[PDB]
Design an enzyme around this catalytic site. Structure first.
Site, PDB file in Angstrom:
ATOM      1  N   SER A  39       0.731  -5.371  -2.685  1.00 26.35           N
ATOM      2  CA  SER A  39       1.438  -4.112  -2.296  1.00 26.35           C
ATOM      3  C   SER A  39       1.581  -3.835  -0.823  1.00 26.35           C
ATOM      4  CB  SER A  39       0.814  -2.910  -3.006  1.00 26.35           C
ATOM      5  OG  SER A  39       1.187  -3.055  -4.378  1.00 26.35           O
TER       6      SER A  39
ATOM      7  N   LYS B 100       5.057  -3.231   0.474  1.00 22.43           N
ATOM      8  CA  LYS B 100       5.730  -1.933   0.332  1.00 22.43           C
ATOM      9  C   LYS B 100       5.982  -1.319   1.702  1.00 22.43           C
ATOM     10  CE  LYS B 100       4.395  -1.167  -4.398  1.00 22.43           C
ATOM     11  NZ  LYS B 100       3.161  -1.225  -5.241  1.00 22.43           N
TER      12      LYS B 100
ATOM     13  N   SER C 198       1.328   3.814  -4.082  1.00 21.11           N
ATOM     14  CA  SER C 198       1.526   2.399  -4.453  1.00 21.11           C
ATOM     15  C   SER C 198       2.254   2.291  -5.794  1.00 21.11           C
ATOM     16  CB  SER C 198       0.210   1.602  -4.457  1.00 21.11           C
ATOM     17  OG  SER C 198       0.528   0.201  -4.340  1.00 21.11           O
TER      18      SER C 198
ATOM     19  N   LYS D 254      -1.829   0.712   4.182  1.00 23.55           N
ATOM     20  CA  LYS D 254      -1.192   0.315   2.916  1.00 23.55           C
ATOM     21  C   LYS D 254      -2.082  -0.803   2.310  1.00 23.55           C
ATOM     22  CE  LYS D 254       1.321   0.374  -0.645  1.00 23.55           C
ATOM     23  NZ  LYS D 254       0.008   0.298  -1.364  1.00 23.55           N
TER      24      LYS D 254
ATOM     25  N   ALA E 133      -3.701  -5.415  -4.016  1.00 19.34           N
ATOM     26  CA  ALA E 133      -4.637  -6.212  -4.804  1.00 19.34           C
ATOM     27  C   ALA E 133      -3.735  -7.147  -5.606  1.00 19.34           C
ATOM     28  CB  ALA E 133      -5.526  -5.378  -5.697  1.00 19.34           C
TER      29      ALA E 133
ATOM     30  N   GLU F 282       8.001  -6.287  -8.524  1.00 19.50           N
ATOM     31  CA  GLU F 282       6.691  -5.889  -9.045  1.00 19.50           C
ATOM     32  C   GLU F 282       6.830  -5.967 -10.560  1.00 19.50           C
ATOM     33  OE1 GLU F 282       3.878  -5.280  -7.693  1.00 19.50           O
ATOM     34  OE2 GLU F 282       4.218  -4.387  -5.741  1.00 19.50           O
TER      35      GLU F 282
END
Length: 256
Positions: free
Chosen positions: A39, A42, A97, A201, A204, A133
């Site tokens: 993430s 992002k 997230s 930010k 995982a 994602e």
């Protein structure tokens, strides 16, 4: 050696790159080693969104359905009926997230391939976006799809948020959202002293990948840009947030 010790204590691989923007001093440990960005991407995606649109254009409303929802839609799942503006999606992506938020934004900028192109245009020849994602989190050791390095992530974060890849007022938006993240209390945030503001930010991914990228502002002077990435060698390994918080204390000492 302090980093080696954490690697021993946590049974993991660490990748660190830290730049004191005020003196140009650096802290590095496997800074060019590739890890799944998870993430953290992002932040870079919003950086591209921002470059592409005026602030007013962010009020455009996006409609979607349950078919656009993925595995983790904290904000997005509550607004199917009305849709959300790009500004709201950007907020959800960064502070919560939200995975669906990331996918909707990605579609707005043209997908992973267009994201790639925009990063290249900014000078980043390392970050390699390829999937949406949540599949982007499934990276095997050796593979380069959806990976970057600590050095590349800090250079790229720095470009958008502190330098000239964005006009002041847009940099301010990105920073505000990052400063107000709700997912990083146990990572970088925990290794910095009270009164030190942080914009971060987290991410995982598979193989116990646990990452946090941020900009840190001491009470006085220039900000520190830092990336802490980590992974383990079991596919379904678990991570320990304490690793990030401790690596951060080592960095601060090394720079402080």
């Amino acid at each position: 050696d302090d980093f080696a010790k954490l690697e021993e204590q946590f049974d993991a691989k660490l990748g660190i790159f830290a730049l004191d923007t005020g003196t140009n001093r650096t802290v590095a440990y496997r800074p060019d080693e590739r890890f799944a960005f998870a993430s953290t991407i992002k932040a870079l995606t919003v950086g591209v969104l921002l470059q592409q649109k005026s602030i007013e254009d962010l009020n455009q409303r996006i409609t979607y359905t349950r078919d656009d929802l993925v595995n983790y839609n904290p904000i997005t799942e509550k607004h199917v009926d009305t849709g959300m503006t790009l500004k709201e999606l950007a907020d959800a992506s960064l502070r919560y997230s939200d995975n669906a938020a990331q996918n909707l934004i990605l579609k707005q900028i043209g997908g992973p391939e267009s994201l790639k192109k925009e990063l290249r245009k900014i000078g980043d020849e390392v970050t390699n976006p390829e999937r949406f994602e949540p599949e982007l989190n499934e990276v095997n050791p050796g593979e380069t799809q959806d990976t970057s390095t600590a050095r590349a992530l800090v250079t790229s974060l720095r470009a958008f948020a502190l330098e000239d890849k964005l006009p002041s007022e847009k940099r301010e938006l990105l920073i505000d959202w990052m400063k107000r993240n709700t997912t990083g209390d146990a990572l970088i945030r925990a290794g910095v002293p009270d009164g030190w503001e942080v914009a971060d930010k987290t991410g995982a991914a598979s193989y116990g990948t646990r990452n946090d990228i941020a900009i840190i502002w001491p009470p006085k002077g220039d900000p520190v840009v830092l990336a802490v990435l980590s992974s383990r060698d079991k596919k379904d390994a678990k991570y320990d947030d304490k690793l990030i918080a401790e690596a951060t204390k080592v960095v601060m000492k090394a720079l402080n």
